[PDB]
Structures are given as C-alpha cells and as structure tokens.
Design a protein around this ligand. Structure first.
Ligand SMILES: O[C@H]1[C@H](O)[C@@H](O)[C@H](O)[C@@H](O)[C@H]1O
Length: 288
C-alpha cells in the first residue's frame, strides 16, 4: 500500500529522564500513521551520541532525527550523515546550530527567548533573587535558558549545577543552597523531575522561596493548582517528537519542508492557574 520507512531518532536522554517518554509518544504516534519503523537510541555522552549517528548512517536509514546539545561534538557526524544522502531533521536542542550542519529543519522552542521571557515574568511577579538549577553541564539548550533569564531578570541571579542522574543529591544540594542564602526567593528548574525535587528541597530547607519550571510531568498540573509551582513553560515534547518523524515523511514522500530555513516553534507557552485545566488531563496521562 504505502512505502515503508526506517527512521533513527537519536537523542542525549539521560537514562531515567522521563521527559523523553513524552518525546517518544509523539514520535511513535507519527510513526504509526506514516508506516515508519522508529529506531530510538540515546546517550548523554555526546561522543557516544556522535557514534549513534554514524551507526544509523552505516545502517542506511531513510532519515535521521537528532538532538544537538553539544554542537562541537555532534556537527561533524551530522555533516557526514548529510553527505551520505540521508535527510536529517534536528529537534529539542541546537536551535542556533542545526542549519550549518545541513539538517533540513528544526523543531523546538527558542530557549534564549524562553529564558528572557521567564526573567521578565519573574521580575513582574516581584522576585528579587533567582536560582536557576541546571541538571547537566555543557548543554546548549540548558545554558541558553539560564543566559536568557540573566539578561532580563532585574534582580540577583545565581546558577546551580546538580547531577540530574542522582536525584537524592539534587534534593540535598538545592536545600543546602537555599539554607545558605535565604535571599533566594525563586528557584527555576529546567525540567519537571527537578521541579519535584526543588519543591521538596524548599520544605527541607525551611525556605520561603517559590518554584517555577520548564516542562510538565504527571505531577505538575496539581502543583500549579495548589500553588507549589508558580508556572511551567511548555515546549510540547509530543509535538517535537511527532514532527521530527512526520516532517521526514513529508520530505521523503513529497520533497516538502516546514519552516522555510528557520526553526518551527513548539513553545514557549506559560501555563499557570488561569490555563492549566486545559492541559492537566493530558499531562497526567504522560502525553504533554
Ligand atoms: O526541558 C528538557 C529537560 O531539561 C530535559 O532534561 C532535557 O534533556 C531536554 O533537552 C530539555 O528540552
């Protein structure tokens, strides 16, 4: 009936980072409709993610969907895949670097803009000293968020790196930082799982800081409703994974692209007490 395609989706997912389950539900929903076999692979070591790109080039996949958190480490392998005639789409990380690579399209949110928006919003909500919590080092999409907050937040700014792989350590490290500096009045977490740890850290520390986050998980909607989280920034991972796949299907079958040489935006969008009801059920089933 229809042509059968094999698409490699290659990411930087740390094992156990549930954000990537929503990316994958989107990608499989596209793949189910487009007669695609989806090969999903990941490694949080960018040298190892490069090797995964090579594996898919050598396997002669029909397309590659790839994340670019560490451009120096990944661009050369992406260029190699393009020179081998395999179409590539970038998503989630690397919005500033995908076009140079020869990647055809990009799906995600402009993380500098989302950070700039979060800094201005935080200033408007009366906060004076923000702590931005980053769960990995050397990831452009995370650094952009924090740099953007620093640009627009009028008050004091502090960054804290935590090991996203060791949840109990994340919790104690955040609580310690809050106890040590009670002037911190807002913690912005860069993922929903880290948000959970921060909410608990604030209680542990006896701090008065509020918490805001990037992304949803199953717990975030309730947390916005009950005041545990000020707001969450939605980047629509389901859309990112879905479009990574479906866009390759449009290119391969009809030569089409989406975005005209610029990224296709999946966010940012701020969800707060005023609009959370529209998302909650979907977040609570893991598809937002
Ligand atoms: O907001 C998410 C979250 O921080 C994930 O942990 C990370 O792997 C993704 O790149 C990012 O888009």
């Amino acid at each position: 009936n229809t042509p059968h395609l094999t698409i490699a989706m290659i990411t930087h997912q740390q094992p156990g980072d549930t954000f990537w389950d929503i990316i994958r539900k989107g990608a499989l929903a596209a793949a189910a409709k487009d007669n695609v076999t989806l090969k999903y692979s990941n490694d949080p070591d960018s040298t190892k993610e490069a090797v995964l790109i090579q594996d898919a080039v050598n396997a002669k996949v029909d397309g590659i969907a790839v994340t670019i958190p560490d451009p120096p480490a990944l661009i050369p392998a992406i260029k190699q895949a393009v020179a081998a005639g395999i179409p590539v789409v970038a998503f989630n990380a690397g919005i500033d670097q995908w076009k140079e690579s020869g990647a055809l399209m990009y799906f995600g949110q402009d993380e500098t803009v989302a950070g700039q928006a979060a800094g201005a919003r935080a200033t408007s909500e009366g906060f004076k000293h923000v702590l931005c919590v980053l769960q990995a080092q050397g990831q452009v999409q995370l650094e952009s968020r924090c740099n953007g907050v620093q640009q627009t937040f009028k008050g004091q700014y502090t960054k804290l790196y935590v090991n996203g792989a060791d949840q109990p350590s994340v919790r104690t490290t955040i609580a310690a930082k809050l106890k040590q500096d009670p002037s911190i009045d807002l913690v912005i977490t860069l993922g929903a799982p880290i948000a959970q740890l921060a909410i608990q850290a604030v209680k542990d520390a006896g701090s008065n800081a509020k918490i805001a986050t990037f992304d949803f998980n199953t717990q975030v909607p309730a947390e916005i409703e009950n005041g545990q989280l000020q707001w969450a920034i939605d980047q629509q991972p389901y859309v990112e994974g879905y479009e990574a796949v479906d866009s390759l299907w449009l290119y391969i079958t009809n030569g089409d692209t989406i975005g005209g040489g610029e990224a296709v935006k999946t966010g940012p969008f701020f969800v707060d007490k005023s609009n959370v009801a529209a998302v909650a059920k979907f977040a609570e089933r893991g598809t937002r």
